[PDB]
Each structure stands twice: as C-alpha cells, then as structure tokens.
C-alpha cells in the first residue's frame, strides 16, 4: 500500500496526510529491523519535516515526529538525512508545543540525534536544545517525560571529546533533583549523565559537588539494581579523583562503609574493580582520609583481594594499598603490615604489568623506611620488615628484577637492595 502512502503524504488533504504518516510510523515502529532506508528513498523525510511545522494539527505533528525519531534511530547515514532536512531546530521549537505528546516526541528525537556522535550532540547543543528542554521540566512533569528528558540529557553529556562544560553546566541543578527519584530508569540515566560531567579537571568536579549530589550518590551505592549502581559508583569514583577537600565531601556521607559492602558481597568483577579504584584514590589522600579507610574496616578485605582476586581487581587493590603507604603515618603503615599486606605486595612483583610491579616496589620501599625508623628508635640490629619481605619470597623477586628490561623497575630494584640489603 506504499503508493497510497507516498500519495497521502504528498497530498493537500489533512485526512490523507495523517493516515499515511501513521502507516509509515507503524512500519518504522516494528521491533524486528524497521525499513528505515526504504522510507527515506520514498522521499517522505522532507515532507515529515514540513508536517512538524503544522501547529494547527498537533496529531500530524506527533506521528511525523515519531516516524522521524525512528528514522533518526537508525545508522549514522539515516540520522544525517534527518539533520540535512533541518529537523534539529524544528524539534527544538517543538519543545515549546502546547501538546505534551509532541513535546515528549521532540525530546526523544533530540536524544536520538544527539546520541549518534559527538558532532551530532554538539549540533543539538548549538541549536539551543538544553534550555527549552529544562524549561518544560517541573513538579507536575509525568514519569514518561521524566524518563525521556533524563535519557536525552545523558546523551547531551555522553561522548569523547566531552561537550563544553559551559554548554552542559545548566543541566547540573536538574540532574541533582532527578537523582532523588525512586524510578530505576531515571536513576540510571541521571547517574550516567553525572558520571560524564564529573570526569575531567577538578573545576568540573567542584560544580558537580556544589550542585549537592554527594549525599544521594552515596545512597545509590546501595541500590540493589546494577543498572543504577554502576554509573553511581563511576560518579563517586570520578569525584574522589579530585583534591583532599572534594574527596572529603564523599567520605563525610559514610561512603567508605558502602564501598566495603561492594567488596564483600557477591557482585560482578567490574563492580569490585571500580570499588577498589575508588578506594585507591581515597588512600591517595591525606592522613585523616587514610584513617577513615582504616576505621571502616577496609584493609582486611582489601589485602585478601590483593592476594586472591582476579588480576583486574588485584591491580586496583595494589594501588589502594601502596597509595596508603605513600601518604600514611608510621603507625598507619604498621597497621597495613599487621593486616598482612607484605606477602600479597611481594607476590605481584612477578606480574607482567610493568606499572603494577613499580606500584608494588614503591609500596614495599615506603614499608621498609618505617621498619628502618623502628630499627633506629629501638637501636636494633635488624629491620623487621626486611626479614618479613625476605620470608614472603620478596627479596628473591626484587633480586631477579635487577635483570629486568624496564628501566623504572631496574632502578627501583637497585635502590631498594642498596638501602636494605647491602
């Protein structure tokens, strides 16, 4: 019935225009491979874009917006054709429509176009879609629109190179409010949007923390759904990459006992990997920040992972442990040793990841300095931690690291041996 459809689309009668646009929308609304390319070649894309400007016929507007959204849902070439026919500024105008159905369709259309590539996202942002998108969001916004707007916002923040922070800055108060929802879809999309905004320099993190999201993000670390957990953990993780004061905003809302529960409960390897990485950037902090990790009871489970977990988790547990030896006090480091961090740190000296070997060598060197200070204070004839590194088969591994091709590993191995085994 395609000739009657093209004919109906290309007619002047309001009844024929609607029935044929509805038929194309239903043809493109099928869940098993829609004929997007074929609907384009029938030349109805420019006529559907003309139907968007029919303010007197909001129902035709809606079907045309649906069909175009499904055309824009296809390959990169299909989205480009929708762009070429100037639909992007018209969908931005449709965000001010009196019809909620049309406004909702305009939102999903813009999210689809923006989701295609960073270039398409920048064109949507350049046509000023952000401010009218936020203006139609308030106390009486229905869940369907809250779900579409949050997804679209996430597509505006997604992609590498990241969008301009000044371009996406107005979305921060809205996302701060949206993460207080109980809806699993809104929480997912809001958290992903905040994980993109939070990734970058510390001035970006500062605007994220000033939006007031830290308390609620920590609560979302306990969300039973991994769809919400994963982007919330990513956002908390990005915030703790910041300075001591920014990292403290996460610690102040009991994030460390939450992070610990992710390590002990039976979750996916990638979840635990992210949780260890987050902890590693906390132990990269000041003495009080390392003390909060200790106070939470994290060292015990962290040392076990460093010793027994899958390599991707061990890698991150090594950074967490060694970062604490870098910024920790004499006693804090003695507490890491009492929790048995020496053997698992030594065991990784033979791992094929060069950076982890060097992370473990620096952690062990900082441990040896504490043991050397104890040897000077007690006027002892032996460095306790030298014998512990020897007993763990660490000394033989360090001795063998002198035969290594990597200059960072080699110079560290020689420095350690000349200082504690001359």
């Amino acid at each position: 019935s395609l000739p009657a459809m093209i004919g109906g689309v290309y007619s002047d009668d309001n009844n024929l225009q609607l029935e044929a646009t509805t038929q194309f929308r239903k043809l493109l609304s099928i869940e098993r491979s829609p004929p997007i390319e074929e609907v384009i070649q029938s030349g109805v894309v420019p006529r559907f874009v003309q139907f968007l400007t029919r303010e007197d016929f909001p129902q035709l507007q809606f079907e045309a917006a649906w069909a175009l959204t499904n055309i824009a849902s296809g390959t990169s070439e299909n989205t480009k054709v929708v762009i070429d026919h100037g639909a992007v500024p018209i969908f931005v105008k449709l965000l001010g429509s009196s019809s909620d159905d049309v406004r909702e369709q305009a939102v999903w259309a813009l999210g689809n176009v923006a989701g295609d590539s960073p270039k398409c996202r920048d064109l949507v942002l350049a046509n000023g879609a952000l401010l009218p998108l936020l203006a139609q969001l308030n106390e009486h916004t229905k869940l369907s629109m809250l779900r579409n707007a949050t997804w679209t916002l996430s597509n505006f923040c997604r992609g590498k190179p990241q969008p301009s922070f000044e371009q996406t800055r107005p979305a921060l108060p809205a996302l701060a409010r949206l993460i207080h929802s109980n809806d699993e879809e809104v929480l997912t999309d809001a958290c992903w949007a905040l994980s993109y905004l939070s990734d970058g320099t510390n001035d970006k993190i500062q605007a994220v923390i000033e939006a007031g999201v830290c308390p609620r993000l920590v609560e979302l670390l306990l969300h039973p759904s991994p769809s919400v957990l994963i982007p919330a953990l990513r956002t908390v993780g990005n915030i703790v990459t910041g300075d001591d004061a920014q990292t403290q905003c996460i610690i102040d809302h009991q994030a460390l006992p939450c992070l610990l529960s992710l390590l002990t409960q039976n979750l996916k390897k990638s979840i635990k990997k992210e949780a260890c990485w987050t902890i590693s950037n906390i132990t990269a902090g000041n003495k009080d920040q390392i003390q909060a990790v200790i106070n939470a009871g994290i060292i015990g489970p962290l040392v076990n992972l460093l010793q027994t977990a899958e390599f991707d988790i061990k890698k991150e547990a090594a950074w967490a442990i060694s970062n604490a030896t870098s910024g920790g006090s004499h006693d804090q480091i003695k507490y890491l040793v009492s929790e048995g961090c020496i053997k698992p740190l030594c065991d990784l000296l033979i791992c094929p990841d060069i950076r982890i070997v060097t992370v473990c060598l620096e952690g062990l060197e900082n441990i040896l300095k504490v043991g050397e200070t104890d040897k000077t204070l007690a006027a002892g004839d032996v460095n306790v931690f030298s014998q512990m590194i020897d007993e763990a088969e660490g000394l033989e591994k360090i001795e063998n690291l002198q035969s290594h091709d990597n200059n960072e590993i080699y110079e560290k191995a020689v420095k350690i041996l000349e200082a504690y085994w001359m």
Binding site: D199, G200, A284, T358, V359, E362
Partner: peptide
C-alpha cells in the same frame, strides 16, 4: 614517584 591520584583513563 608513581603513586597518587589517578584520573579516569
């Protein structure tokens, strides 16, 4: 020397 804060990738 190698230890400290790490940004995402």
């Amino acid at each position: 020397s190698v230890l400290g804060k790490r940004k995402r990738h």
